[model samples]
Target: TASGGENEREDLEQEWKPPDEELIKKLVDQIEFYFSDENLEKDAFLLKHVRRNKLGYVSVKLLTSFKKVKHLTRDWRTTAHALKYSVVLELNEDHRKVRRTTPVPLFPNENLPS
Candidate 1:
């Protein structure tokens, strides 16, 4: 019993805990925009083009290259798609770049968000 208790305690210690509510809400808001129709189509275009180009999936490197040389916005859906993905990725990167004191778990990587 005591040995099992020790294991349980260790499990608790190692257990993944998500950040606070406010931070989580902000994170949810960042990506849930994709559920919207206009934004959804935009993502489709990116996937289509990436597949067409034989890249499989969009990468930060590919997006960066596109941003540098030519920003293609052939239609409204394309523009919105690029803007949403690019903006969200940039926000995530910028947030991660901040050093110093941060919360225990930036994201609930171990398990699904509670």
Candidate 2:
């Protein structure tokens, strides 16, 4: 027989829904801007840190929905469209190139004194 816990679980499952396709694309587009060269020198460091540390503030913020972020991470890893790019690793590499320090300035390369 289904107990209270089972009913609660079913309710939660019913309540949690993925965003619409358009909203998902909008979110992806918003995130993609972080990769643009205009901000890459500044913002890409966050992605690098998140990859190394296994998720950071922005990632948590992005997971404001009830669905787990691991699902999204797994989706990124598994989807053919996502497989073409080594996104996180490259961000870390880019971060290392741009920043000599941990804090990661807005213009890591430009702000540093020669």
Candidate 3:
């Protein structure tokens, strides 16, 4: 008799490794969207990180762990380089962190719409 609880998760081994160019584009696009003005208006959790650093800086380490690109590469350097093409995001000198080039927009308040 087969043990019912012995299900193997073979799918975990599947990884999507696209070409560097394509992967960089995808990574930058997602990261740009995360720091976009529209997204920041509603993303309080992200705002916390922005406010914590006071300059909106968030480490590349966190970016590499994002579910969208986590499977592609764990190297923060790759993520930092990928962000080079981003118009809204800027990398620090060592390329170990990133932040939006624009100022964070005011948070949307339900009580007052301007």
Candidate 4:
């Protein structure tokens, strides 16, 4: 167990890492101005149209893509949803059910010549 660490899961959700207050205010003001009249949406009609067409399309596409990836990655939970971490634990490309053709060897397979 020299190289082995405890496989304990914290089961804690990650907190939102908020930025600084001044930066937040500046960004908020900039965003308010960005979505304000004559800058992004000139009128209610334009706003509604953007929400219904452009924003809606983009949001739908993003949500659909996110759902697809979530389902595809549902099984790879041991690696904090990171494929690289999963690969290190030999858990890549796995699904809900893992089927092994043969039983695992208790000792390392040293029969094959190096």
Candidate 5:
């Protein structure tokens, strides 16, 4: 009956559209790479100083679809079947232990299923 304004009560507010699933995954994968142990401290410090968190203004659709799928931080090891491994640094490029190689046959085809 009333919208508390000059117009009749169509009292409907705008509904926000959620983000696309592909967009979320893309964001997560891209950002996650930059947040690794080698880059976190430096990047975070830089971002803090910048204080510029926006894709564009007049785009009230901030992170319009962000929170729903960007969960890589919490489950890096399991979320995408991703695994982490370590390698040791060496002072000399020629080390006998490093040069050794073992040939183990892998039947990768057996791991696949139709």
Candidate 6:
């Protein structure tokens, strides 16, 4: 048995803060780019997953794993809410998934400037 006062551990802690406007904007932008025609046409992996769902829905769980937004937040509800700011994206009723509001364009330009 160990004494409670004897071991004082300094653990890194994170606060449970709500997502702000700037953070929401960043998440919206990052997600929009992922589903953008320019990216969808070239990213076979993402396209595969998007296509896996007949409605083209991508899981919020998957989006949160991306490096750009991984550190932003882990709450799927928060991410879904943030994505609401994107005119090009839509969230599922359950708020556990997202997708482009419009279908990927036909014959997207692979060389289009970012």
Model 5: which ten-residue window has the lowest total lDDT?
83-92
For candidate 2, lDDT tens digit of each residue in 1-114?
564464455335464344445444533443455545566565644455445432322333322221332345444322222212324323223222111222334466554444
User: Model 4 reaches what TM-score against the true structure?
Assistant: 0.26
RMSD of each: 18.3, 11.3, 12.4, 24.2, 21.9, 9.8
lDDT of 4 by residue, 1-114 (tens): 577545445764655344344433332233234334354333222233334332211111221133323343233232122322212122214321111222222224422324
Query: What's the lDDT of the predicted structure labeled candidate 2?
Result: 0.38
Best of the two (2, 4) by lDDT? 2
Q: Write the per-residue lDDT of candidate 1 for residues 1-114, one digit (tens) a residue.
A: 454354455335564443344434343243344223445354443333444332223332333334321343223233223333333333224232111121122224432433
In angstroms, how far off is 74's CA in candidate 4?
Answer: 28
Model 6, backbone clash pairs (residues 3+ apart or across chains), number = 0
Error of 5 at 86 (Å): 26
lDDT (C-alpha) at residue 98 in model 4: 14
Off by over 4 Å in 4: 1-8, 11-14, 41-114
Error (Å) of candidate 6 at residue 51 is 5.1
lDDT by residue for model 6 over 1-114, one digit each (tens)? 675644345864554456787878888787767777777774444446545545677777677776656777666567766765555567766665676557665354542424
Displacement of the residue 16 alpha carbon in candidate 3, Å: 20
Q: Determine which window of 10 residues in candidate 6 has minimal summed lDDT.
A: 105-114
Q: What is the lDDT of residue 65 in candidate 6?
A: 72
Q: Candidate 5's residue-wise lDDT over 12-114, tens digit each?
A: 5555444444544554353344334444344333222323343111110211222432343443222222111111211112221111022122234432324
- Determine the C-alpha RMSD for candidate 4 after optimal superposition of all C-alphas: 24.2
